[PDB]
Design a protein around this ligand. Structure first.
Ligand code: NA
Ligand code: NA
Ligand code: ZN
Ligand code: ZN
Lengths: 605, 605
């Protein structure tokens, strides 16, 4: 029941002062100061957070709220039909409103992602802000300040005015850009320049331990090459400068959140020190960097809302996140963050996920999964393979691969998806405002690269139940399965000694034997198994990942079923699974007669 | 973005057929059938569920949705601004629409409360229903049927039409009453008569094991006495019959959900077999039963919404839940479910919670906590004592105790809160349609019992930051603290060897030493401790509940701080706590000069 935002001028400055020193309790103390308008005033806590596409504003972690007008406490009343809105009565003749409160950041992952550690912290200004209703967020001039733990370094795209002791005062900035300008801070910090020039790019690394900061020259070069490969694709940079924020940690909550001139990224402490073991997650920075073009600068019209407290429309997330998921993996290969073999096996895993690992495609479309952020909030679901889960990411990626293959086929390889990126995102270098688009704009730009009924193509994939993996075969490769482990799966289930058996027994297991996932309508599903049941023994032998894998191989081509001793709650039973296909892991193999367009796409420019 | 529901007739019957046989996967298979009106049609999945006061409808657990009109599949489109709304186009000349889908109930507590076990199940019809938009829910005639696991018994307030094998068909009923008529089913079942007559009351017990059903005659009498004591209070029953549903289980998710003619209740398997050990939870059935009057029959006007897909206004929950919490404990004493000593120590614990255990009262009011269902959804919060948490329950209980004492003082003990209950809820015996009320109705009825400015009294308590425990002293008792354990705390910490130290060290601990709660501004809080930290040792000795309690006693009156070895994540440190007050547990003591009105209130009528 809050009035709609108005594109009207905001008089004065919204001052946000944050004390970020209580690392033990994980509390941010906040004071927000703003001109006071006589009459009923409504203050808003940001609800829909850009980049999350859902109402992730942690309203229940705002505590200790006290509001004073010219030094006098005024009682506040929350709108019971808009719990993010706080109403007060401002007397006639008033000058200034001051709101003080605390943001109680998660004390465990069960409360949300952790944002403070003994060595670092992550400040997202939307969690420490109240702003007046009735204004477009871009119309509110803001000025932020933060008091850091003693001696800590910090990094943010937002420009600093001065640091006095441990209190950093920033230059004035529009309120929407303030929310889009998060801060990392910590005691173990290394700043590396990735690109010089007029629009420079920097890498800011914070770590649990200083040893994680020892990035080698070739490792830094791959990150510098990422910026170079991005320039080749778009031909423009949508920022006056860019600040990568990377936390190498086991304590901070994982994050991959994009912004115009920065991104919040988390990685394992061995991101650099064990480069060959930590590769599966190294597409993160390429992914978030691409969003500066696709998502931040160019955004769906129904997603580009006027403030943080009106609902966002996620209908075009299969471009926002879908093509960014596509380019994140592509750019990883082009920059050297991934090897070509690593990128190709990653692609095989995605292709298998939609050919055999998503039986829920029979009833649900990828378009409907753009509602998953608001529907699920990434909360646990029983069957990610049947309920589906934000498949506008990887399912959208597969479509954009087919778009690339179709663009090549229509033009005899003279045009590709690279031409769409430059045409759709490469305009107005230096602009980091919002440039909205609609579905028709995507179709029109695609048609400008190569004439075709792109409207039908896009809708048939996003609104259909059929195959999404056509881009693999069109670009000269074929998805196959054999007993050779997938490079991603091998790395992602080793050390833990887990067992991914999605395409054989239709389940995944931990080393303990606990089932961690069950494929809908697969062999494990048809034995009544669910996640949380335990495989106790295989053919009478105590469970291990190697034991169940060897039994799958021993059952290949025979008629002797696999005998599984299963614990369901407090009961034990034995099931016989008649699976005789052996171990099956996805790979890509060349089609000899066809041109290898896939390697062209993944090749450095 | 869904059109508002209108109080217009709905032509035909909404048929809801549920297959509840897949206990292994915990899946409810659903077929919903209704007349199909040509043109655009929107189907709604219930979102706001009565009794939860929040949008708890599990939309992301609806899977496999296929909609057919006269046997022909029609594509559905979800409203991206209303994810509970499914839109289809019904062709001209059509007759019938059928929607088939599956409700994937929780496979572990992390997905929600478990609703299916090998021995029992809980069917909530809102999870297995789709209904047409544009109609008041009470205008939709519905008919439900369910196929049970072979041979299982069932219980529900809904009248049965026929059971053919294991398929139970219920008589037609208004759709809003269908959602309000849940079913328990199981293999170990006992039906116990609590009250005969024209408006009979029955207790339906389902258990993990048949041995738990051996309720003794004196135990049944206490439940029968509960019905008699409620008759004395209200003088009317708002149902044609009432069916308690009680699950004695360690497998089904806990539940306490009220309805007009039934309630969903869970207890431990030793609810009857270890009567003396399971007492702390025995106010549940009294609590839920009272809601048939206070909450179901009488409801705040802003809470009595026209369908399940418009937001609810929780502003008057301090009567709905607050006075029900009050009567739940009082009726436990009056009926014999609790002894008078147990009820008195329970009340002492509530009084201490608001005298010393709720420092968040300094900034937040009890009225604002009526927004907690939608703000928090009972998700984990760091400081329930400072953020506060649904204090319209126990904080509301204390206000109603003060209301009772004021009614007695105004009338020389000739009137009490019993007269409000009869006046406000005792009209129209047999009626179980909703009779809404506003704040002014509460004031007017209180004024009719005894003239007073009740509007100011209620607002000052619920919009204030002052003491809520004034009814204790006004009714002749005083809240005190000593080292004698509270009966509730002792029972709720024994066997597990846990340690509740809220009023000494300001924290609670598990037997492992893991801190489970920290009181804002208390001694543990002032040492930087948070929930999830571990107390490893006390004065150098490995932690136990007895060890830390003995150290608290040993520190009483001295100046030697308590040395606690603490594990915080992967670091160990020793903290010195300068607490010298000893162990402190709350109790109620008589005021010798004042009349004992409290014992009158808790005495059986
Ligand atoms: Na801007
Ligand atoms: Na009714
Ligand atoms: Zn992304
Ligand atoms: Zn209740």
């Amino acid at each position: 029941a809050t009035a709609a935002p108005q594109d009207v001028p905001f008089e004065g400055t919204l001052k946000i002062d944050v004390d970020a020193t209580d690392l033990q309790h994980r509390i941010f103390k906040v004071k927000t100061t703003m001109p006071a308008t006589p009459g009923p005033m409504t203050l808003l806590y940001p609800q829909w957070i850009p980049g999350n596409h859902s109402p992730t504003g942690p309203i229940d972690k705002l505590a200790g709220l006290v509001i004073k007008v010219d030094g006098k406490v005024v009682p506040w009343t929350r709108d019971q039909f808009d719990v993010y809105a706080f109403k007060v009565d401002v007397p006639q003749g008033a000058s200034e409103l001051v709101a003080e409160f605390k943001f109680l950041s998660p004390q465990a992952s069960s409360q949300g992602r952790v944002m403070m550690t003994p060595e670092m912290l992550n400040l997202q200004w939307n969690t420490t802000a109240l702003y007046p209703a009735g204004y477009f967020a871009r119309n509110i001039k803001a000025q932020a300040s933060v008091t850091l733990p003693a001696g800590w370094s910090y990094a943010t795209a937002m420009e600093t005015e001065r640091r006095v002791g441990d209190t950093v005062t920033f230059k004035p900035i529009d309120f929407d850009d303030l929310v889009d300008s998060p801060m990392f801070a910590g005691k173990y910090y290394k700043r590396v320049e990735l690109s010089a020039g007029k629009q420079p790019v920097y890498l800011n690394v914070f770590a649990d331990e200083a040893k994680s900061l020892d990035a080698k020259p070739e490792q830094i070069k791959a990150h510098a090459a990422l910026v170079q490969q991005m320039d080749k694709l778009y031909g423009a940079r949508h920022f006056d400068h860019y600040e990568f924020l990377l936390a190498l940690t086991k304590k901070l909550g994982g994050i991959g959140l994009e912004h115009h001139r920065s991104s919040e990224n988390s990685g394992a402490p061995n991101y650099f020190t064990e480069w060959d073991k930590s590769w599966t997650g190294r597409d993160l920075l390429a992914h978030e960097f691409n969003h500066s073009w696709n998502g931040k600068y160019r955004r769906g019209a129904d997603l580009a809302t006027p403030n943080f407290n009106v609902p966002m429309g996620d209908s075009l997330l299969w471009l926002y996140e879908g093509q960014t998921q596509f380019w994140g993996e592509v750019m990883s290969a082009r920059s050297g963050l991934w090897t070509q073999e690593q990128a190709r096996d990653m692609l095989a895993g995605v292709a298998a996920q939609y050919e055999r690992g998503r039986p829920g495609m029979a009833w649900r479309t990828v378009q409907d999964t753009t509602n998953d952020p608001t529907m699920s909030m990434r909360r646990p679901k029983a069957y990610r393979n049947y309920q589906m889960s934000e498949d506008y990411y990887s399912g959208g990626q597969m479509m954009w691969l087919e778009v690339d293959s179709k663009l090549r086929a229509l033009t005899n390889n003279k045009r590709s998806i690279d031409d769409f990126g430059k045409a759709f995102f490469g305009m107005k270098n230096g602009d980091w405002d919002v440039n909205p688009y609609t579905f028709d704009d995507i179709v029109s730009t695609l048609n400008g690269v190569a004439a075709f009924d792109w409207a039908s193509f896009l809708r048939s994939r996003m609104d259909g139940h059929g195959s999404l993996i056509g881009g693999i075969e069109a670009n000269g490769w074929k998805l196959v399965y054999n007993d050779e482990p997938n490079l991603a799966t091998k790395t992602d289930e080793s050390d833990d000694k887990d067992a991914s058996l999605t395409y054989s027994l239709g389940m995944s297991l931990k080393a303990s034997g606990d089932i961690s996932d069950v494929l809908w309508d697969g062999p494990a599903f048809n034995a009544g198994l669910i996640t949380g049941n335990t495989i106790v023994a295989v053919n009478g032998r105590a469970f291990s990942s190697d034991v169940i894998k060897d039994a799958i191989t021993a059952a290949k081509g025979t008629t002797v079923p696999i005998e599984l001793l299963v614990k369901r709650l407090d009961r034990y039973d034995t099931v016989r699974i008649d699976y005789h296909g052996g171990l099956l892991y996805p790979h890509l193999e060349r089609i000899a007669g066809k041109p290898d367009r896939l390697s062209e796409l993944y090749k450095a420019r």
